[PDB]
Design a protein around this motif. Sequence first.
Motif, mmCIF file in Angstrom:
data_model
loop_
_atom_site.group_PDB
_atom_site.id
_atom_site.type_symbol
_atom_site.label_atom_id
_atom_site.label_comp_id
_atom_site.label_asym_id
_atom_site.label_seq_id
_atom_site.Cartn_x
_atom_site.Cartn_y
_atom_site.Cartn_z
ATOM 1 N N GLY A 266 48.179 -15.278 -62.155
ATOM 2 C CA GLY A 266 49.333 -16.044 -61.657
ATOM 3 C C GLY A 266 48.856 -16.928 -60.486
ATOM 4 O O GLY A 266 50.150 -17.534 -59.878
ATOM 5 N N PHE B 29 47.225 -20.498 -59.332
ATOM 6 C CA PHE B 29 46.822 -21.662 -59.780
ATOM 7 C C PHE B 29 46.679 -22.613 -58.582
ATOM 8 O O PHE B 29 47.464 -22.555 -57.432
ATOM 9 N N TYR B 30 45.685 -23.445 -58.445
ATOM 10 C CA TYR B 30 45.395 -24.505 -57.333
ATOM 11 C C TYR B 30 44.789 -25.531 -58.022
ATOM 12 O O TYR B 30 44.215 -26.443 -56.864
ATOM 13 N N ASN C 157 46.922 -28.217 -59.636
ATOM 14 C CA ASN C 157 48.098 -29.055 -60.128
ATOM 15 C C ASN C 157 48.065 -30.607 -59.579
ATOM 16 O O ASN C 157 47.945 -31.356 -60.699
ATOM 17 N N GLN D 278 61.392 -32.418 -62.482
ATOM 18 C CA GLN D 278 60.902 -31.392 -62.129
ATOM 19 C C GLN D 278 62.156 -30.327 -61.246
ATOM 20 O O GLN D 278 62.577 -29.189 -61.576
ATOM 21 N N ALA E 138 64.809 -29.583 -63.868
ATOM 22 C CA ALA E 138 64.713 -28.370 -64.807
ATOM 23 C C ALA E 138 64.329 -27.099 -64.265
ATOM 24 O O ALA E 138 64.407 -26.223 -64.770
ATOM 25 N N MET F 155 59.729 -16.632 -55.523
ATOM 26 C CA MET F 155 58.356 -17.018 -55.182
ATOM 27 C C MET F 155 57.500 -18.049 -55.890
ATOM 28 O O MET F 155 56.880 -18.940 -55.295
ATOM 29 N N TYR F 156 57.508 -17.720 -57.211
ATOM 30 C CA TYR F 156 56.667 -18.403 -58.009
ATOM 31 C C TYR F 156 57.421 -19.610 -58.403
ATOM 32 O O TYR F 156 57.024 -20.492 -59.283
ATOM 33 N N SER F 157 58.422 -20.397 -57.705
ATOM 34 C CA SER F 157 59.212 -21.486 -58.169
ATOM 35 C C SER F 157 58.344 -22.761 -57.855
ATOM 36 O O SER F 157 57.271 -22.564 -57.608
ATOM 37 N N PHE F 158 59.006 -23.663 -57.758
ATOM 38 C CA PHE F 158 58.605 -25.054 -57.426
ATOM 39 C C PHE F 158 58.924 -25.283 -55.895
ATOM 40 O O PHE F 158 57.666 -25.566 -55.449
ATOM 41 N N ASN G 115 56.600 -24.042 -52.798
ATOM 42 C CA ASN G 115 55.109 -24.296 -52.617
ATOM 43 C C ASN G 115 54.954 -25.885 -52.690
ATOM 44 O O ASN G 115 53.885 -26.141 -53.426
ATOM 45 N N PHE G 116 55.575 -26.701 -52.176
ATOM 46 C CA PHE G 116 55.454 -28.168 -51.904
ATOM 47 C C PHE G 116 54.913 -28.473 -50.787
ATOM 48 O O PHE G 116 56.021 -28.537 -49.708
ATOM 49 N N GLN G 117 53.961 -29.114 -50.560
ATOM 50 C CA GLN G 117 53.491 -29.548 -49.251
ATOM 51 C C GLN G 117 53.035 -30.897 -49.489
ATOM 52 O O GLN G 117 52.006 -31.309 -50.094
#
Lengths: 95, 50, 49, 51, 101, 50
Positions: E10, E12-13, E15, E69, E72, E91-94, E97-99
């Motif tokens: 689960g 990923f790095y 994207n 994004q 959706a 936690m696993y959302s979009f 984790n957007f920086q």
Amino acid sequence: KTAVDSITQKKFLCDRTLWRIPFSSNFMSMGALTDLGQNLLYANSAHALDMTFEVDPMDEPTLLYVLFEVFDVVRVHQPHRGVIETVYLRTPFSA
Amino acid sequence: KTAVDSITQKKFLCDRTLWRIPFSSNFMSMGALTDLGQNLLYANSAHALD
Amino acid sequence: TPSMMPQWSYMHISGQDASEYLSPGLVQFARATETYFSLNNKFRNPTVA
Amino acid sequence: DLRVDGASIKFDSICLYATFFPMAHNTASTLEAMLRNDTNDQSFNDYLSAA
Amino acid sequence: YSGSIPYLDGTFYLNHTFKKVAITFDSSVSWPGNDRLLTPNEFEIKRSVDGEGYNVAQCNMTKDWFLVQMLANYNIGYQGFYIPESYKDRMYSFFRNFQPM
Amino acid sequence: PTHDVTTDRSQRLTLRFIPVDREDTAYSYKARFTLAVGDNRVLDMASTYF
């Protein structure tokens, strides 16, 4: 063993807020429009108001900031394409 | 007051997710099964994909 | 009421409710597609103690 | 202060943006008719609210 | 190798290494058609720093992809953006984790 | 829902608007625009950001 005689100071901090005073018979918030706003005695006549403040002294000029919690509404209407009309109503202090 | 001529770079990091594209006419999520799935433009025939 | 009857009632300061001063069609429509396109926040609901 | 320290700024380009819901056309016309009649006007009330 | 396994963990790095993506049916149509999107025939994720007509939020990101994004994930955007609610975004959302840097 | 929500006559999803008049002084910066919502659409300020 060799402590010394002392006195005490007390104070507090309440930063990042405002001082509030509602306008009701019992200070509660029972609705958006309080009861006493609908009492005739303060509604069918005119009256004069006096406020007196007493604050801690400071060394440089300051400003007292007073907010009169009031009503202020706007209504918008669009009869025909390309025309838009509005009416603003302000509660006491509308002059 | 001694600094020099400079340029600027920008980028981003969004690890720990997936990239999604849903099947809809407006990308919204109005149900588990979607209209274009039911829509007979893509529910009556067959085609290929690239 | 010598002062402000239709004035106060006009701006929805007091009186009726959203589900009460509208055409039935609009209320039904709002009930229909409230989910993915809201409208409720567009009309005042007066409250009086 | 920043007037005496030579901090400056210059705007070059400005644009405007908006987005639309691709609503079903006849439904949109129905909604417009539903909303143009006077007795369904709109009201709004700023928060703070005061003098 | 014996590290974490993205295909099952689960995590990923990678994207941010995508540039553009295109979809086609039977060599004649673009799945989003009818000029829905600003770059109609292909999604644009991040233009090169040069293509400065279409950035957003001070990152190097195209507006279209951000909009798609966000929608959706939470059906948010047709009524102006804002921070999505807590419970709807885990936690696993979009958006968590957007920086931008 | 299958239908009666989303048309398919070709229409844009996002619109970009250009200034038509702009004025400048030592302090102010003034701009004007022709916001033209087309026939049979509904638009929500929300989605309006300079």
